Amino acid sequence: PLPWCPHLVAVCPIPAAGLDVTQPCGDCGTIQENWVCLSCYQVYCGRYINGHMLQHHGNSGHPLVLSYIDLSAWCYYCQAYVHHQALLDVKNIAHQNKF
Ligand SMILES: COc1ccccc1CNC(=O)Cn1c(CCC(=O)O)nc2c(Cl)cccc2c1=O
Ligand SMILES: [Zn+2]
Ligand SMILES: [Zn+2]
Numbered sequence: 001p002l003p004w005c006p007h008l009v010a011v012c013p014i015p016a017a018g019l020d021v022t023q024p025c026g027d028c029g030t031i032q033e034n035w036v037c038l039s040c041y042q043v044y045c046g047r048y049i050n051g052h053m054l055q056h057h058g059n060s061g062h063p064l065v066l067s068y069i070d071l072s073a074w075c076y077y078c079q080a081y082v083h084h085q086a087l088l089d090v091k092n093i094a095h096q097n098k099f
């Protein structure tokens with residue numbers, strides 16, 4: 001992954017409610033291949049399901065999303081995975097909730 005991207009400034013604090021890696025897609029309710037938005041922490045499905053997270057990106061401009069499958073972070077603008085110390089809080093909480 002990239003060690004940095006200019007959109008990490010948009011990563012927001014984790015809700016103290018925490019993360020639910022089994023939360024369904026906010027639009028279609030699928031339990032498959034969801035992503036969480038690291039700006040507003042809405043959960044939407046990936047492009048191989050119904051593409052609701054890509055739609056969310058298009059209608060919000062929010063850049064960075066985290067996979068509830070493998071905890072990788074995707075930037076829609078950079079079209080790359082990103083990993084940085086700024087993502088470690090969210091990844092560690094997601095990992096604890098998942099495993
Ligand atoms: C942990 O990996 C995955 C986890 C679950 C499902 C698929 C993958 C493969 N990884 C991706 O699908 C990453 N990605 C995304 C993610 C956001 C989305 O699915 O909305 N959008 C792209 C888009 Cl929008 C265009 C081109 C490439 C990608 C891309 O590779
Ligand atoms: Zn969906
Ligand atoms: Zn968002």
Ligand SMILES: [Zn+2]
Nearest residue numbers: 005007075078
């Ligand atoms: Zn970026």
